Design a protein around this nucleic acid. Sequence first.
DNA 1: ACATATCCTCAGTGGTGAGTATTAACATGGAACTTACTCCAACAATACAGATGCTGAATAAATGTAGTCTAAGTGAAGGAAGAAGGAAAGGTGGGAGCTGCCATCACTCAGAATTGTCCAGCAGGGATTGTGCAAGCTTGTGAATAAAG
DNA 2: CTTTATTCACAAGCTTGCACAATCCCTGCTGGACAATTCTGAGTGATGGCAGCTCCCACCTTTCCTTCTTCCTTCACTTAGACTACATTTATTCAGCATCTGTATTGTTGGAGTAAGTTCCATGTTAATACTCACCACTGAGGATATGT
Lengths: 107, 107, 97, 96, 226, 226, 82, 79, 95, 95
Amino acid sequence: AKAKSRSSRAGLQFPVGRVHRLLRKGNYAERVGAGAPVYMAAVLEYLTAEILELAGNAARDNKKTRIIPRHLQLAIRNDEELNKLLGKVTIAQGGVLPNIQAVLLPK
Amino acid sequence: AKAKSRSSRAGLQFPVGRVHRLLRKGNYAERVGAGAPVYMAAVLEYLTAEILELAGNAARDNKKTRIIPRHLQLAIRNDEELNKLLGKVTIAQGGVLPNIQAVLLPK
Amino acid sequence: PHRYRPGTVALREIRRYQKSTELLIRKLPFQRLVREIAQDFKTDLRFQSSAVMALQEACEAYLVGLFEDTNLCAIHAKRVTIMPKDIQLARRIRGER
Amino acid sequence: PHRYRPGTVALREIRRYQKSTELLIRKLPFQRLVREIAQDFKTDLRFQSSAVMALQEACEAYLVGLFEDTNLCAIHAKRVTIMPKDIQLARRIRGE
Amino acid sequence: EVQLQQSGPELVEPGTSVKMPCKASGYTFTSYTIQWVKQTPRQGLEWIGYIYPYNAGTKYNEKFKGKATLTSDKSSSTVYMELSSLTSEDSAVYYCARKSSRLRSTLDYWGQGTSVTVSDIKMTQSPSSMHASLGERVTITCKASQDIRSYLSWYQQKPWKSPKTLIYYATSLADGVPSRFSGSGSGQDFSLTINNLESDDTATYYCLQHGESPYTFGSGTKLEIK
Amino acid sequence: EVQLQQSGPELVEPGTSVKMPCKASGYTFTSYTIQWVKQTPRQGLEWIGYIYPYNAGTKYNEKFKGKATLTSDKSSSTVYMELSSLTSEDSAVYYCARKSSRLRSTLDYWGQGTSVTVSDIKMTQSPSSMHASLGERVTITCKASQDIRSYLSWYQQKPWKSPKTLIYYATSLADGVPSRFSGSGSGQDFSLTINNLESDDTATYYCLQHGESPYTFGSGTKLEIK
Amino acid sequence: VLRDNIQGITKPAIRRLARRGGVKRISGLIYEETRGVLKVFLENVIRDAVTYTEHAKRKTVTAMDVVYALKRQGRTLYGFGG
Amino acid sequence: RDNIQGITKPAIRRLARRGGVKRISGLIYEETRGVLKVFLENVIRDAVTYTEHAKRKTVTAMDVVYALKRQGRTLYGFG
Amino acid sequence: RSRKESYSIYVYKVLKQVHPDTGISSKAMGIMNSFVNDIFERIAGEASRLAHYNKRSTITSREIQTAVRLLLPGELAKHAVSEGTKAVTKYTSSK
Amino acid sequence: KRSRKESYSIYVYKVLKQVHPDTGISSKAMGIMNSFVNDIFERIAGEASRLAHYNKRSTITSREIQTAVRLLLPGELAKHAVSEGTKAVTKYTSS
DNA sequence: ACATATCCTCAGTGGTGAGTATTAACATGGAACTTACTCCAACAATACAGATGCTGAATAAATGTAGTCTAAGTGAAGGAAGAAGGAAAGGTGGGAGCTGCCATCACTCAGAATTGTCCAGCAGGGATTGTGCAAGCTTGTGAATAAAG
DNA sequence: CTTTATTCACAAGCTTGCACAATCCCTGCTGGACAATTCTGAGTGATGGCAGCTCCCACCTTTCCTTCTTCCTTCACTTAGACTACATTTATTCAGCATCTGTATTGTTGGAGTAAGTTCCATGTTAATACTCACCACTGAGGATATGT
């Protein structure tokens, strides 16, 4: 008897056990194999890492050291893929991307 | 005792038992409350009857005995609530509504 | 005195409100409008503060995105003034009508 | 001889192709297009006839709806001729 | 919430044309048809036609074809009715009524009606006029000439008032109508039952079929209490 | 499938400007950044900048700001580079490289390289050049200056040819690369291991970081067979 | 009993929402149209939220019901639960 | 393999006439071919993914129906 | 072969109930089967989400009624709720 | 005596301190992150449930999750997510 | 071409309190371990339906030419929208109280799963009709061209 | 230059032939109904507490109304070329038939894998806590803008 939770055995930080419990209680299938929460936790951890790193870079080019939802909106809306995933998603207190159409500028 | 069915108990044509089996095995909940398939079958039968009655009326105005998918499309698209229910739905071999914009006509 | 030409202040307002993040509608009139609308569905209802807050961010985001689509419709017609026909066309193409 | 002014046969074609329900693209070029597009994802795969038929119905319905939105954009721009800018505006508002 | 505003009375010279507004509020205007019913004291209520503002779809009665013209304006949420070539038999009350595009739905909310003065299937109602006490049972028959799939409605009209929808789909109660009224029957035989009487129930009761394309009202029963 | 078409060699007198295109085909053009690097005999590969066609977002090296500008044409699926005021030390091979907006991804596909002829994290590679037989094991070290969280890539370049991507994310194999090449290491210490060699491994190997804002290439290790 | 509160969505508020949307010029009939559009959107979302509240046998509309209503209408909102 | 030229000019003309278009510019056809190619790639990629998950080498109508559906473009009449 | 089930006899019984002269084609039957399956999936998924939100492990007719109130538009939802309530009342009142 | 709520705010902070050691986060941004992880979880899990139901299978395996990631996520995002899931499953079935 | 007041917007400091990163208490759900049980890889066979080829008849696309008509550029009036100032007015943050209902806890009870039998409704295959497509003829009707005024 | 009678082509309507698909009938067979039992999950009540009303207030920021200007929108002319329309040539597609074979599908077995039950402990949540970062206040420099030069 011991240690070694399933996240540490898979080298992750997202909980494999909680994801397995949510997959079991979420009424998705009759059975859940014990590789599906590992894959699922890895995918969620990768997506969280990508969004958090892009938002940290957006905060870093803002002379700031704390991520606000504006930085998350700037991270998501500046990417083709990410915007596509979260294209029908509203972020609270995120604002919009700063853009003006070129015909509105004076000349 | 002669094994009468649940649809005849509820006075329906759509199957209560098959809807109960699809609700049970369709991974929707842990339990199904046994009045839910009666309600579901009644709602499905009402929607089928409304669509079929409007399609038969369209076929009669088109002087046709049989219903083709054009009659179903003409029944669905001419009703606001039915078109709201099936806005993101393509009906095969249904065509479109006859609609020319008013500017495109001569004079 | 000193006056700015039209479109100069209107461009600095675009540059100001696109970099800011907070809500653009006042909180209390929107809360009163939400309660007025909800009283037609169920009497004596009582919202939470976060429910009205979420409703305000949702409505403001929807209105802002419709205003970008309206601006694109206005620019397509070789104009810079948005008109109700642009709102109707954007809502028609979006599927809201 | 006899010759219809422009826009008359066009309106006749609009009425005729809005009255009918048959598919407007020939089946063999669409089948070849579907097979070549699927070649980039799979090297050697077969297709059901129903699969190509469903693909054709969906593609023709999508193109007819996009042409409806394109015509609306052209009329909003005070024109009766559709341009590629109308297609681009309609696909931008639709989110495509 | 739902109301149908109509104009005042019209004193029209014959041979002209008259416009009728049906300004609507309280509901999504495009999702409900607007029907038009004419009411004379000699022919009773007659269904004229309907307009669907979703596609501006018209349908008229055969005896009102050409004589009546229905139009819709979605900007002001208004329904207009045109009568041209006014014959001397046009002195009647014109009601516009809301009705959903669903087949089960009926003419639920009615307008006040404009009184204009010029200067199929037949419903048989067995009692023309009957007398009832303060606590009696009232049964009204609406025998139909043809077959309808339970598409019959029961309406109550006070003198100098708009009709009030009591029963839709031949058994279901309308919104706000008490459970004293009870509809029954199907096919060709229908009945309306008033359980216990009040002083409010002094009214004329009609039955309308909408199972076929020309909608037909009944002759009507006059019910007066004490 | 993915092609990065470019132009030929441009002989240019000093003082004027020069244009280089990067016509791209085989992929969704707006979803991938186009990055430009230059190569000289004197100092090897160095990263100039990139342009994201999704929002036309540029980012340049600090030593190439003003010297190089980047534009994109979405209709022709092309990326244009302007170099202005060509000095004497500007005769170089200019490469454009596809790279996804994902931070893990690298310069996977490269252009042919336009030869222009005119009339910070330090990368330390310990072996400058080495010789090997037809079957032994080669190890190349790429100790870096600062900390990069596994954002290192290994490239193989034939003489007079575009560099070929071998390793991305310091351990993962590129598309089509066999399992003979193996990347290892993390943090500051990285290494590339060739298991058994062929006659096609006679090439120059580079390591590139993209953890920081200015991307820096390696010094380059020449590998010659027998 | 509240009445006529759509006028509380003032013309400067609609102008600010247009400025965030990138609009340079605004016609005078834009504001009534925007009030009608915002009203229709609000009744749709509030009707779904009140349905979600009445299913839970609650008299209090929560933020989670608003989030489910927005998710139902394809307008998923982040940062308010769920 | 080309085969985008098999979607000919009068086929796009017929699809525009069904959409109510009276006058068509000459540059419409290439834009429509590109749009149809993008839509077909997006549907066919998901259909082939559904086919490969089932360990099949044949794309069925069910896979196309599921692929269409996932894009919010539900198609009736094919099962 | 393998006995695949559908709604064809049920839709045909409904059609002969509401139109006892009017036939139907095979393609229109396929459209009707797709419609019934799609609406079944929508109502069942909404009822599943409604049960999951309120920490309930069963789907009752209240969840189905609320789901019908959510997906279906106004008078459509009202008449479907009336039909479902009538059927559940008839089923309870008769075993 | 009121029950406890659970979220991803502890693991998301761990991933943040991996990818950015000297960078904090606000509570609103953590709420956005929790909503994002929940939304992507429901999307992938529902997609995989549909994949298992289409193939008449009764279990969700890592193959279903891989196919759901391929269908849901766009190109290079799906490629790197498949890479991460494969590496984690390979690492998990070795100890 | 230049010169110059003038509102507006970043670029730095300092204070500070709002929020947020850090540390115990505990409780609860995940891990270890074992047992049952069942579901789906793994072969094996077998029709079957999709790919490929051929061929002739429809039949739609390509091309060239004429002629219309429509998109686009230019010009001008005018009126509608923006900018700014001054006065009103209502949002906002704070500070109380009141109380209604929301979540928690315990009880228990009717209802829903479970399992075994069996039977009858439903899907597949095969005769059986029937009604809508096809071909041919007639006819109203809009469109466009010549003709008298 | 203005309505208006031939001319012309096109789609709608009417009338049989028929043949392919729809309706219906026969047969296994499998999924649904009957019935007794258990195992719950969810409905009645009671409770505490918290959070959502309602009210008062000071302030000061936001909004509304007026006036002037300007510049953008809309209407009218013109025109050149990019369209539509049609005849003719051509090339491609449709449909029927045949052959071949990879493949989808079904059947059987059993072994790996996964659900289920106990326990216990280590992790995750909440309460309390001491700072860190961002915002406001305040100058100070730097570009932008309208303007007389």
